Curated annotation (Swiss-Prot), chain A:
Purpose of the protein: Promotes RNA polymerase assembly. Latches the N- and C-terminal regions of the beta' subunit thereby facilitating its interaction with the beta and alpha subunits.
TM stretches of this protein: none
Assembly mode: The RNAP catalytic core consists of 2 alpha, 1 beta, 1 beta' and 1 omega subunit. When a sigma factor is associated with the core the holoenzyme is formed, which can initiate transcription.
BP terms from Gene Ontology: DNA-templated transcription
Reaction catalyzed: RNA(n) + a ribonucleoside 5'-triphosphate = RNA(n+1) + diphosphate
Assigned protein family: Belongs to the RNA polymerase subunit omega family.
PANTHER family for the chain: DNA-DIRECTED RNA POLYMERASE SUBUNIT OMEGA (PTHR34476:SF1)
Lineage, uppermost ranks: Bacteria, Pseudomonadati, Pseudomonadota, Gammaproteobacteria, Enterobacterales
Any Pfam family the entry gives: RNA_pol_Rpb6
Domain of life: Bacteria
EC assignment: 2.7.7.6
HAMAP family reported in the protein's UniProt record: RNApol_bact_RpoZ (MF_00366)
Name of the molecule in the record: DNA-directed RNA polymerase subunit omega
From Swiss-Prot, chain B:
Function summary: DNA-dependent RNA polymerase catalyzes the transcription of DNA into RNA using the four ribonucleoside triphosphates as substrates.
Organism, as annotated: Escherichia coli O157:H7
Subunit structure: The RNAP catalytic core consists of 2 alpha, 1 beta, 1 beta' and 1 omega subunit. When a sigma factor is associated with the core the holoenzyme is formed, which can initiate transcription.
Name of this protein: DNA-directed RNA polymerase subunit beta
Family statement drawn from the similarity comment of this UniProt entry: Belongs to the RNA polymerase beta chain family.
Length: 79, 98, 1337
RNA sequence: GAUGUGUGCU
DNA sequence: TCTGAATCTCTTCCAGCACACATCAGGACG
DNA sequence: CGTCCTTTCGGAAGAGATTCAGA
């Protein structure tokens, strides 16, 4: 469940980068096969992404590092 | 009254008006300022492109929505091309650079 | 895909390049088997196939034949959408002038050829001839000859030289004209000539010619040899009901043009006589002018119903054009509307969507789950399933709707709170249930207004709706730091009734053991909600490092105030509910909860307050009856006394003791006093009515009158309205404004007369017509404000400036209108403020003045803080985040990249509906006295007389802060002096409103220098006193002998020589103006500061704000001194009197004409400074700009418009007005060129000058000096660098013609151009997108 | 489909 | 007797939203 | 049918356009 996004704004201190980071994570959960990093309570992808931002285990830097690591792994497995 | 998709106008490919014609509410000039004040750039873009004039990016959004996806490939509103052609129908050459 | 939009003229080669064919037959669809014609306005071979992937003749019908043009009819097999993209063209038999470039005012054709518009139009419409290539004759290249003159010229000089007419002659003139030679000649003439009107005309001409040379245009392209046509699908022939085809105005205009074009071609093939083909060419010219811009000619042609038909230029401009109807705003899918009801069970983030409306909005979302759960196999199956509304699509809908916010918009979206996103709850019904606490933000009651639901589709749109537009995130207004989630009118009546004390109860001596026992006793009916019990309550406080420590106490409260304590969160003091909570008390309770506990506890608290107010307002049964409006027993006696007094005044008037006006004023005053007495008696009898036995003898208490309770709580009521219900209605005004001298002596409880009710309707309909005509005037103002300031966006984070404005508390002469704390809160300082421990730094240079710093500034008693304002920011095309300050909606600095110029305009324009549309100095308090710009002398009576108009008398407190400010006129006697401790309630300065004196400074003898009776003095002796009054006549009445002789009153010594004025080497020559009566006689000793001679002598509504923001010059502008130094006169009133100012050191080339209507505050013997007033009246905010600076004009605009708003009780922060002022200061004229490439009188943008000068100073060169300009919000929008914003704002034709001739270019950098084009605005998330886009190039 | 008229609601 | 300042015509715009009706070249010669 | 044809209850900026009255 989600009502207020204040803690997420505290973690990503712009509220305009928060929208972009949460949208990126929600599109990862929705279009991609990525699983949520938090036990969902039958929430939608946007609310799960916002909660993961609140719990602290995602931001723009973490998402970029994870994407770069997975791209490197896919390149290595390509041979 | 409510409308998801219906008939669209002829010269400007926008949703029709009123309740008799299965028409959509007019996101007016003053509501655009309210979206600009919030900073809601993506909501505003999907208001004036996808669920409006832009015909090519309007069916792709419908397919995405009934595809499990929520993502738009926006283009140029077909009412701006109407404006370009109506200005070009005067003795005025108006064009897009690169 | 594209990063700029370029507009220019169109060459005939370019127009042929656009076209896919030529239209030659003026015939639309065949009125047959409905197929297009051969070469008509609708044609398959030119524009495209009517059917998709089908040829017109029917030879090809499939996709495999795509690309090959047919042979029978020449129609390529392709999409049918090419009929709205492929243009044609018309080859005009004769050249035709574009109406836009001929009648744009100024005329581009008329200005390019330096010919008047009348001559150009005469030659164009074949009413005369113009001369080309005059040769070796007496006829020049720009001479006009009528028919008889042309016949005479052919008789005398009928050689190969030719003169022509029509657009062909003008095209020949334009083509034979050389641009560069004309530019050189006109630059030389500009350098040579001295006439200023000639100078500006020449520089306008040179600007046009240089713009034509630079751009890839040619002068003769204005004359249309080829005229293009719109594609058919943009001017469709829609089939009406029947075999008929609905009219299209463009098709009629195109057929009209082709008719005359074909007739002209046929006539020119037949070698018809010259007059007939001349008339045919004139008719073709008129047809083309009606096609392009119908109505710009004298009489617009009408197609049918005697109404002008819509041309090409009429569907690009105006409210019904392409810009303001289909591009700036548009109709939107996935949307609906319905009536709104209450639904008080919702939470702050919830709305209630009808179950039949959410199934239509979220229809594709339901499809995408009926096709994913295996409940359907294709789109048709799911479509029919939701069509028949099975019992399985209601749980699919309840899952789609789970956490998908929807926007709720109310039609007059005045500010941004009018669109908020709510989580939907499916309800049975057809009304959109809307939470009660957001109604104040929406300005929405439930008397029948409707809302529109919009559905955010994409993930970014949903997360914007949740993180930016959610009603949870908007509990502070963006206009000021005020809360917007405020309980109103039923929640506050419930909380007022619950938290009140009556001195008796069911249980009043009982001592409770907690709030829960209080609720248990109230619900059981063992105690009253208004008891006076002692409850043992534990309250938490976070005085530690964010840690809550408890304290338990035994407090004397009521049962209701203890029941309410069960909802107040942990952290708030108990003395927040231990009172009688009105509206302000609980608004302040929510405000302190927000600042102590944050946002989430406040959002939880607001719903609890709403529920517990509704419940205990329902439980009270707080009704209203007719016995609740208590008429005073003394109302009849007061009315009778007033009747007796007006009868006495009438008796006095009949005897002739008083005049008509005095009688009227006395009657009005005594009736006002009677109304005040009735109101006071009624209010006392209402407020303290309830007398209740206190378990002893008897006691008074605040009354439980129902109407008084709902007036006291602030729920719904005032003092004026309760006065009109129980007291008397009072004095009513005529429609013009004059008060009727007999008030309404009755009230709504006991009737109104037939005449007393008709009298009320004057002011009843005045205030309804006002609000009817006021909406259309406030909407225009907020639209202009948005379009001026639309594109500021906070772009940088710090600009590093040491400039700013000196924020000081505003003092009008009495109580402080606004303290320093409100004017300086949440803004970044510019310099370190000095504590009165002088030379010790109190605050740093770039700190954010939040509440903690404002309290510290107040403790040290500072009264002037230099702060960083938006108008002084140094960034380009944006505003730094530090030169703006607090967000005012969020509790931090403004985020980089968010549109402050739209928030400013909305915040200023939203309260537009609340504004209307149609002596001696008495020091009030204790303190010291200061005089600004001291210029005074001691009078012989022992006191001071001041000799300068710009003085200010300031009453200072004992701390040192400025508390009162007054203006002291010229020659006013003081009662005390500077630095002397005055007593509150005494007059300090005295003067006369009339009788302007010419008082001296020192004593001596007076000799009437250049004063003899009959020459400059008329013989007009005051008959009342008999003293010979030396009255100098004015300019008109005096003879010619008194004009060249200027009277003077020189103060001499005993020997008759010149008494020297101290401080200078000039004597005391006092020149007298007209109407200066002299009571003193010759040979009289004068006093120190005695009157030698005496001279006897607006709107604050919405129009005032519009005039301030549009910078209109007032009718009688105050005159200001444009240079310092001494002042004198010149020629003897050369029509208007010439005033000459001479500086002490520099030369004196300045001299201004002044009409004798305005009385000069200055005399011939004063040294004036620049910016000081030479007359009286409202200053135009251009003189302030160019004399007193930029900060002076921003302070003037801010103070004036804020006074207008504050008179009506509207709070708007000054950031917004400073933003609009900054957008009003964008142009900057050039003084001298220097090493830059700007023209001399060219008005170019300030940021361009700034960047050019800063890159010149980086090198060894020297920049350019500029004079800052100020334009109104309507002129600063049309003169912006983007021709798309200007075209979509106003005057589309006037902007597009200038942009076309100048070959202008649009970079799409604002907020409106990106909306029009269709890409992301550079304001929110689009700011990050545009930063990436610009960094990629 | 465009315009006009009129009513009404904000 | 050529020139800057004071009058003289003509341009533009005047908040948003639904909903009823009417009119859409038609007159006329061939 | 087929087909051709032709007034008038506004207020500001501003851009001609004239006048004036002055040297
Ligand atoms: Mg209402
Ligand atoms: Zn064919
Ligand atoms: Zn700045």
């Amino acid at each position: 469940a989600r009502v207020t996004v204040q803690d997420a704004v505290e973690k990503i201190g712009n509220r305009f980068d928060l929208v972009l980071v949460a949208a990126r994570r929600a599109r990862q959960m929705q279009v991609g096969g990525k699983d949520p990093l938090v036990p969902e309570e039958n929430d939608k992808t946007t609310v799960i992404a916002l909660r993961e931002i609140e719990e602290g285990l995602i931001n723009n830097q973490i998402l970029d590092v994870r994407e770069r690591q997975e791209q490197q792994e896919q390149e290595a497995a390509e041979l | 009254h409510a409308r998801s998709t219906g008939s669209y106008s002829l010269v400007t490919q926008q949703p029709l008006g009123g309740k008799a014609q299965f028409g959509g509410q007019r996101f007016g000039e003053m509501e655009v300022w309210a979206l600009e004040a919030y900073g809601a750039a993506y909501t505003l873009q999907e208001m004036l492109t996808v669920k409006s004039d832009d015909v090519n990016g309007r069916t792709k959004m419908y397919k995405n929505i009934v595809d499990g996806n929520h993502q738009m490939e926006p283009g140029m509103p077909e009412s701006f091309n109407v404006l370009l052609k109506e200005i070009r129908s005067l003795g005025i050459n108006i064009e897009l650079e690169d | 895909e594209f990063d700029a939009i370029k507009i220019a003229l169109a060459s005939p080669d370019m127009i042929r390049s656009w076209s896919f064919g030529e239209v030659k037959k003026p015939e639309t669809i065949n009125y047959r088997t409905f197929k297009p014609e051969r070469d008509g306005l609708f044609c398959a071979r030119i524009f495209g196939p009517v059917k998709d992937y089908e040829c017109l003749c029917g030879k090809y019908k499939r996709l495999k034949h795509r690309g090959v043009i047919c042979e029978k009819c020449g129609v390529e097999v392709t999409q049918t959408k090419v009929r709205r993209e492929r243009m044609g063209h018309i080859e005009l038999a004769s050249p035709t002038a574009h109406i836009w470039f001929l009648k744009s005012l100024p005329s581009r054709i008329g200005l390019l050829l330096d010919m008047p518009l009348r001559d150009i139009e005469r030659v164009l419409y074949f009413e005369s001839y113009v001369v080309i290539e005059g040769g070796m004759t007496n006829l020049e290249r720009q001479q006009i000859l009528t028919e008889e003159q042309y016949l005479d010229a052919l008789e005398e000089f009928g050689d190969e030289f030719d003169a022509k007419m029509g657009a062909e002659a003008i095209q020949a003139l334009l083509k034979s004209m050389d641009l560069e030679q004309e530019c050189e000649q006109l630059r030389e003439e500009l350098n040579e000539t001295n006439s200023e009107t000639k100078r500006k005309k020449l520089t306008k001409r040179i600007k046009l010619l240089e713009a034509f040379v630079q751009s890839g245009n040619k002068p003769e392209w204005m004359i249309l040899t080829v005229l293009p046509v719109l594609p058919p699908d943009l001017r469709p022939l829609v089939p009406l009901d029947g075999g008929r085809f609905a009219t299209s105005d463009l098709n009629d205009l195109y057929r009209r043009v082709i008719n005359r074009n074909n007739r002209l071609k046929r006539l020119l093939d037949l070698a018809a006589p010259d007059i007939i083909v001349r008339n045919e060419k004139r008719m073709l010219q008129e047809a083309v002018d009606a096609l392009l811009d119908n109505g710009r000619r004298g009489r617009a042609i009408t197609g049918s119903n005697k109404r002008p038909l819509k041309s090409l230029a009429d569907m690009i401009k105006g409210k019904q054009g392409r810009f303001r109807q289909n591009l700036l705003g548009k109709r939107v899918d996935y949307s609906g509307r319905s009536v709104i009801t209450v639904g008080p069970y919702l939470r702050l983030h919830q709305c209630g969507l009808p179950k039949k409306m959410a199934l239509e909005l979220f229809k594709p979302f339901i499809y995408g789950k009926l096709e994913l759960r295996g409940l359907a196999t294709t789109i048709k199956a799911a479509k029919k399933m939701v069509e028949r509304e099975e019992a399985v699509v209601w749980d699919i809908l309840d899952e789609v709707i789970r956490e998908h916010p929807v926007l709720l918009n109310r039609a007059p979206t005045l500010h941004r709170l009018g669109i908020q996103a709510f989580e939907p709850v499916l309800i049975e019904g057809k009304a959109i249930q809307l939470h009660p606490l957001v109604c104040a933000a929406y300005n929405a009651d439930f008397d029948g207004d409707q809302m529109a639901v919009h559905v955010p589709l994409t993930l970014e749109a949903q997360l914007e709706a949740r993180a930016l537009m959610m009603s949870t995130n908007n509990i502070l207004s963006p206009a000021n730091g005020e809360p917007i989630i405020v309980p109103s009118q039923d929640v506050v009546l419930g909380l007022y009734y619950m938290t009140r004390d009556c001195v008796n109860a069911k249980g009043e001596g009982m001592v409770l053991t907690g709030p829960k026992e209080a609720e248990r006793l109230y619900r059981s009916g063992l105690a009253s909600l208004h008891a006076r019990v002692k409850v043992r309550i534990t309250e938490y406080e976070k005085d530690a490092n964010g840690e809550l420590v408890a304290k338990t106490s035994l407090k004397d409260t009521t049962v209701g105030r203890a029941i309410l304590w069960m909802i107040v969160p942990k952290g708030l003091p108990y003395s927040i509910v231990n009172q009688a909570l009105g509206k302000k008390a609980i608004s302040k309770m929510l405000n302190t909860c927000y600042r102590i506990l944050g946002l989430k506890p406040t959002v939880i608290f607001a719903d609890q307050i709403m529920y517990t107010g509704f419940a205990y307002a329902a439980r009270s049964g707080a009704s209203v009856g007719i016995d609740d409006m208590v008429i005073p027993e003394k109302k009849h006696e007061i009315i009778s006394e007033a009747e007796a007094e007006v009868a006495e005044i009438q008796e006095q008037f009949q005897s002739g003791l008083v005049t008509a006006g005095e009688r009227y004023n006395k009657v009005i005053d005594i009736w006002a006093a009677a109304n005040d007495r009735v109101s006071k008696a009624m209010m006392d009898n209402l407020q303290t009515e309830t007398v209740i036995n206190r378990d002893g003898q008897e006691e008074k208490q605040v009354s439980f009158n129902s109407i008084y309770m709902m007036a006291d709580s602030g729920a719904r009521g005032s003092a004026a309205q309760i006065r009109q219900l129980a007291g008397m209605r009072g004095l009513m005004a005529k429609p013009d404004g004059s008060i009727i001298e007999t008030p309404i002596t009755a009230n709504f409880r006991e009737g109104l007369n037939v005449l007393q009710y008709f009298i009320s309707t004057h002011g009843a309909r005045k205030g309804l017509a006002d609000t009817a005509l006021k909406t259309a005037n406030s909407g225009y103002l907020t639209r202009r404000l948005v379009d001026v300031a639309q594109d500021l966006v906070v772009t940088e984070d710090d600009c590093g400036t040491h400039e700013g404005i000196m924020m000081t508390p505003v003092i009008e002469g009495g109580d402080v209108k606004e303290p320093l704390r409100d004017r300086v809160l949440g803004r970044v300082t510019a310099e370190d403020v000095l504590k009165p421990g002088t030379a010790d730094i109190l605050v740093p240079r770039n700190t954010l003045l939040h509440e903690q710093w404002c309290d510290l500034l107040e403790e040290n008693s500072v009264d002037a803080v230099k702060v960083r304002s938006v108008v002084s920011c140094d960034t380009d095309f944006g505003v730094c985040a530090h030169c703006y300050g607090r967000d005012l909606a969020r509790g931090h600095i403004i985020n980089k990249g968010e549109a402050i110029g739209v928030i400013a305009a909305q915040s200023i324009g939203e309260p537009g509906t609340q504004l209307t549309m149609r002596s001696s100095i008495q020091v009030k308090n204790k303190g010291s006295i200061k005089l600004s710009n001291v210029k005074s002398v001691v009078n012989s009576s022992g006191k001071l007389v001041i000799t300068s108009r710009n003085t200010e008398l300031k009453l200072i407190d004992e701390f040192g802060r400025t508390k009162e400010s007054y203006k002291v006129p010229y020659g006013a006697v003081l009662a005390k002096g500077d630095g002397e401790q005055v007593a509150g309630g005494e007059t300090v300065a005295n003067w006369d409103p009339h009788t302007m004196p010419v008082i001296t400074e020192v004593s001596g003898f007076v000799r009437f220098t250049d004063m003899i009776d009959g020459q400059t003095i008329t013989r007009q002796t005051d008959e009342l006193t008999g003293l010979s009054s030396l009255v100098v006549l004015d300019s008109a009445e005096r003879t010619a002998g008194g004009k060249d002789l200027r009277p003077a009153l020189k103060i001499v010594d005993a020997q008759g020589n010149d008494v020297l004025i101290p401080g200078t080497d000039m004597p005391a020559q006092y020149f007298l103006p007209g109407k200066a009566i002299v009571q003193l006689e010759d040979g009289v000793q004068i006093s120190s500061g005695d009157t030698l001679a005496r001279i006897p002598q607006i709107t604050g509504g919405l129009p005032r704000v519009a005039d301030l923001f549009e910078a209109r010059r007032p009718k009688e502008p105050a005159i200001l001194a444009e240079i310092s130094g001494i002042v004198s006169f010149g020629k003897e009133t050369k029509g208007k009197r010439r005033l000459v100012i001479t500086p002490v050191d520099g030369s004196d080339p300045y001299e201004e004409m002044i009409p004798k209507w305005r009385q000069l505050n200055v005399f011939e013997g004063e040294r004036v400074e620049r910016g000081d007033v030479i007359s009286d009246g409202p200053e135009a905010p251009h003189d302030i700009l160019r004399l007193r600076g930029v900060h002076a004009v921003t302070r003037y605009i801010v103070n004036e418009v804020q006074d207008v708003y504050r008179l009506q009780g509207v709070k708007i922060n000054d950031k917004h007005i400073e933003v609009i002022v900054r957008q009003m200061l964008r142009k900057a004229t050039i003084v001298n060129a220097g090493s830059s490439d700007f023209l001399e009188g060219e008005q170019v943008e300030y940021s361009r000058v700034k960047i050019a000068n800063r890159e010149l100073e980086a090198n060894g060169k020297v920049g350019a000096t500029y004079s800052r300009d100020l334009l109104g919000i309507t002129k600063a929008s049309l003169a912006t660098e983007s021709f798309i914003s200007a075209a979509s704002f106003q005057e589309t034709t006037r902007v597009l013609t200038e942009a076309a001739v100048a070959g202008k270019r649009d970079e799409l950098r604002g907020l409106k151009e990106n909306v029009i084009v269709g890409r992301l605005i550079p304001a929110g998330t689009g700011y990050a997108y545009h930063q990436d886009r610009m960094r990629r190039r």
